Symmetry: D2
Subunit: 343 residues, 4 copies
Amino acid sequence: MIDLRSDTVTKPTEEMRKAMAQAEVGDDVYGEDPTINELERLAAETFGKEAALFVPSGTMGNQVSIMAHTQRGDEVILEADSHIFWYEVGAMAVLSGVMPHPVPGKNGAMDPDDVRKAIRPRNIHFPRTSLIAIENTHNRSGGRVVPLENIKEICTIAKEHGINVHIDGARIFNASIASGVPVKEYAGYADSVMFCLSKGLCAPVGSVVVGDRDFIERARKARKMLGGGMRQAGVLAAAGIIALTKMVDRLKEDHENARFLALKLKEIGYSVNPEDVKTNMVILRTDNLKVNAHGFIEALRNSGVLANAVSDTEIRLVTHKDVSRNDIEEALNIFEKLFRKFS
Amino acid sequence: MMIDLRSDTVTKPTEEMRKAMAQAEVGDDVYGEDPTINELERLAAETFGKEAALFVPSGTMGNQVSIMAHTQRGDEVILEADSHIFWYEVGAMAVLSGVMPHPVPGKNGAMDPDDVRKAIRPRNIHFPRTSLIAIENTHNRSGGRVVPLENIKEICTIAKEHGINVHIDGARIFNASIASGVPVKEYAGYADSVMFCLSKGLCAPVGSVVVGDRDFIERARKARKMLGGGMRQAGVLAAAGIIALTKMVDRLKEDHENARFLALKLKEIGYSVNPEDVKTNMVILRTDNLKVNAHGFIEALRNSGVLANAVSDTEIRLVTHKDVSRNDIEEALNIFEKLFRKFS
Amino acid sequence: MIDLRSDTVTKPTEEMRKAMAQAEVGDDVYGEDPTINELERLAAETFGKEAALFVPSGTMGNQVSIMAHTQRGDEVILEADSHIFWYEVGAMAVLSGVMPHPVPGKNGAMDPDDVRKAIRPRNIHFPRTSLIAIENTHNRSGGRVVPLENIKEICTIAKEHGINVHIDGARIFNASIASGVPVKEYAGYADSVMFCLSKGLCAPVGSVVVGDRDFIERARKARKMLGGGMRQAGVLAAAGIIALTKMVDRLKEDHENARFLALKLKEIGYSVNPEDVKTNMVILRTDNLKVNAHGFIEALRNSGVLANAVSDTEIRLVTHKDVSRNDIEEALNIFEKLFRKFS
Amino acid sequence: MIDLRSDTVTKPTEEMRKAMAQAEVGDDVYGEDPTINELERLAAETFGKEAALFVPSGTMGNQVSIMAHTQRGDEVILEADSHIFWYEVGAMAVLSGVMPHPVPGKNGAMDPDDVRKAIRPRNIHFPRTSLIAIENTHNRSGGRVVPLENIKEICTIAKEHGINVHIDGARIFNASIASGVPVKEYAGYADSVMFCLSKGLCAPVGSVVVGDRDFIERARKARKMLGGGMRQAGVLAAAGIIALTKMVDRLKEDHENARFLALKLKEIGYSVNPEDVKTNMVILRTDNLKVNAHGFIEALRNSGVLANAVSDTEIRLVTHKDVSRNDIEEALNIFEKLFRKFS
Ligand SMILES: Cc1ncc(COP(=O)(O)O)c(CN[C@H](C(=O)O)[C@H](C)O)c1O
Ligand SMILES: Cc1ncc(COP(=O)(O)O)c(CN[C@H](C(=O)O)[C@H](C)O)c1O
Ligand SMILES: Cc1ncc(COP(=O)(O)O)c(CN[C@H](C(=O)O)[C@H](C)O)c1O
Ligand SMILES: [Ca+2]
Ligand SMILES: [Ca+2]
Ligand SMILES: [Ca+2]
Ligand SMILES: [Ca+2]
Ligand SMILES: [Ca+2]
Ligand SMILES: [Ca+2]
Ligand SMILES: [Cl-]
Ligand SMILES: [Cl-]
Ligand SMILES: [Cl-]
Ligand SMILES: [Cl-]
Ligand SMILES: [Cl-]
Ligand SMILES: [Cl-]
């Protein structure tokens, strides 16, 4: 099976397996796991922040950040098609008791003026806007890169209003490789950032939240409350350190494979836009096919290719370390066969 | 005094209401022993063709206990993108029920049935369960617009197929009914619960009512207790409510006629208004062609003796009600005319 | 019917009925109801606080106070048999996301030393103790008065720890009448005080919360969220002013009637302890009767007396304005006849 | 350093490090991790339940169970000194919006009659009692074994009222080893059971919840919301399988060591009760010493012995795989010296 469903399916490299087996560990609840401690120190340093927190998943990373930045009844401004709003089981309402305030965005970039208008005036009928979330390499729009200038202007707006800014940077390294903007620069215009180690970076488990000392202390207590307070998590952190320090550069290979995939799919005749492919995702439309997205995903599966439908007429293809050029070439042969059948 | 066009919530008690309240037969509602509250609820249920009803201190509580009784923690509630529950209820749905709003754009409060269908979440571990669809009749933000019965009917059909609850925020459902000629029981027939206000156009000093099935109302009553709405001798308030429900509905037509007159005349003056959009007691005025924004115009109006609310930086809302007579409207219009000269 | 079920059943006096009819009103959401404003002004003044907030019920008064004093995950120290812990539908957990930390007490008085031990130390595993609640004229213990010294000592402990103090003073005036301690004296040892107007004071609806301006502003927003933001509530406030300003002194009559009732019931042969009757409540045990509390309550109803069973062997009798000495004497004749039948 | 703070400090065995390194993995979100799937299958099998769910910690294990057994506003009956109430950061109130209803217990055993009386009657003022929690091998009381008879009785009561029963079995195997009661028998009197792999069983991370298929489905969704939905978690499950299948028998060694430790401490003169030591814990009182628990803990630390204070006058000592009889002897020599200084 050629897995193009997501970059979450990446498996540990041999270097990672050895590192986990030889991991120096301790009880993290007491802050005594050396490897977890080093991963957090490294993560904080890399993002230009004073502190960091390791978590079991990007969802918990986002949720502890929301809890640490807000109070019950607050409102959180976020992009209309963001992961926090659509794919996190409504956790923000249950855990933090906060309201989402959706703002339309163009490929992840909310117009600064719209953000300004989304901030609630001081009134008894309205919740207090205390957080603005930005997702970089906006998933739903096809792994699009949010311009640094966009984040910079929103940060200015936030500062004037005393509002916190959190970047959902699950794939922030993909954004950095594509844009040439160091992650510490994106983070310089945010109060906190969550990034995943378990997707394109290939770690088996976990993400990290970076930010100020006080913020992280609150997020650490939130993590304890949610059930993320683990013991000898250094076994996971060992692979995390390798993901952070050795798996970033090669992300360019995933981007190269995504573009190649898009160009060939277009050449075949599929409804794809190579010009929109800047990171590791390709959106394919079923508009010119005698079947919808769901029916096409089924056809692909029966032929050996796995992918997810994101709407009734759109499917998402995602490249990563475990889908080589060879697999991309094989996938294309299948796509070519299916095009003749469904065009 | 001032010409108050800010909202219909400012209506004061009629002479008949004051006497009824002061002479109300009461009891302890916690024991379900207040005779006036009981009669108000019986009358409300009957009027909407439902089995039961619950008196609450505000429309906000009416909506929130309904949301609580219809949902479980983590569920999603589909509602109109500019609805009151979403924008003006202090984020209560999140704090009180732990639910997520699922905004669906609507044309004048009417969410496209197919859009509602698409908004229902598929069963997936990543997604919360869609357990409630809320509809606001005479959608406030759009200008007191009337949601067509057929729209509500279509959404009900969709909800039923999916086992989803339907709640109508009918704060001004009687205005909708007067304008459309559709009995409120018909709108309610396509919903599981309906909340309606007695304290706005109907002129009661305090209160709203939620109507629905017996079991739902029992659950809503427990939610009311938890929220702090379980009052004692509330019969004092229910006395005015009975009069509002039974004698103040027909005259809403007068408020509509006044709002239409106001809109037509504002249009003649040259203001950015759409008389064709005015079917109930509200008029939206845009300040696009004025040399001042909404807030600046509101201040100028206040300075001239007219009260109104800005609903955006370019829009103002004018609301008619029992306490603004046709003569008051004429006076406001004469002022609106002079201000047009000053700001045009 | 002679209603001894509770003081909540009190009906409006003729004075109140007239006041409600001619009450000057306005939209309270805009802070424009003159009568509500005067009631809050008078209440704040009466308890020596900066501000006050009118609410639909004592339950909401307690809940908006908890919300205004706490943050999600905090702990609230309260008496093990208090109304907030027992009869408020678990609202503190749902509305504020806080956890109760029950402390046993002797007739409503928690041992100051136990309160100190209940304060959580700073640790990632523990919620932060941010509030201590005290109930005066403790309901479940039979309308007992909490000593001023107890409240004074707990206030000292709270201050030393930066913890807020809330007095559930639903029947604080009854406490004051019995102890001779002015309500301002009680209030001085608390950050906030909730007191009911709808019980012994005879108003038909409402309670009031008093405290500092910032606290009341937060409580007012909580009231809006909960659904307590009414419009022309001046009609209710008119009766409320009369309840607060003219119905306090006569509470002494309820206390006298309760004691008289108790002394005579004991004389008849009922299991009552007149010595325990400190305010307007009398606890009657049914152990020596041929039927239990529920069966006896039914026999009483048949004879024209209403009361509530609080357990299988206990009945609570409560006196109030609508229970005159003549009603007490008539009730006693009924109790006399029933003792002949059920002893 | 001789670590007697907790059994959570246990480090991975050689067999475990190798297993993690070669673990076959997959994306758990897709239910595709074969090692996680095998661990859950084995757990369900071992406890005689239909399904199982791996979680990052015992705290999440308890919290997803509570969320899956209850609705907002419900009440949960639990032992007055249970972990869920004291050491889980008020999570039940924030996550589930439920109220704890503490019930006194003798070393973790709540009197069945007290439990019956704690169940709320159907009344608008009361929350609905939807769950009863029992902690077998009650931590606070000193790792005490709750009698099977007690659990059976409470199960009978729960059935009568249609109430769910959850056993916090963080140390259910220690209880089984000491009582001779198979874990499957304990589980038979409960709807759900949470047990840890990260304590005495020596896994670096994780716990498991077992129960009916529908309950586990709800718990799994709760896990996703809380942020416990990991990817290639098989790395951790590999050590978990070894913990569950190979590390149970040797727990007897920890019990022998704890008993020996207690016996010798008593001979030295310390306030311990060797007769109360049946599993891997020893409670040491400081009432007969010159310093309190906190001061004695600091003295022990300076001498090479780590332990935690559980109150101002009580210290908890816990044995585990990483504490050999030799380590206990060395510790005893240290305690001996300190008795001379602080007795
Ligand atoms: C921007 C962003 N933020 C947060 C998260 C949540 O992280 P996890 O909880 O999956 O580790 C994801 C993962 N997303 C998953 C994927 O893409 O396969 C799916 C969509 O849930 C994400 O893409
Ligand atoms: C559709 C609808 N639903 C619910 C409510 C809430 O009712 P209350 O809580 O104010 O009684 C309102 C009141 N609305 C008020 C007004 O129009 O003046 C303001 C906007 O909050 C409403 O218009
Ligand atoms: C009965 C019981 N239930 C649940 C938990 C929570 O498990 P984790 O979240 O620590 O994995 C613990 C851990 N307990 C810890 C320890 O003993 O060192 C401390 C006390 O929090 C426990 O003892
Ligand atoms: Ca991975
Ligand atoms: Ca090749
Ligand atoms: Ca009104
Ligand atoms: Ca005129
Ligand atoms: Ca009363
Ligand atoms: Ca361990
Ligand atoms: Cl190690
Ligand atoms: Cl009456
Ligand atoms: Cl729920
Ligand atoms: Cl008036
Ligand atoms: Cl908060
Ligand atoms: Cl593998």
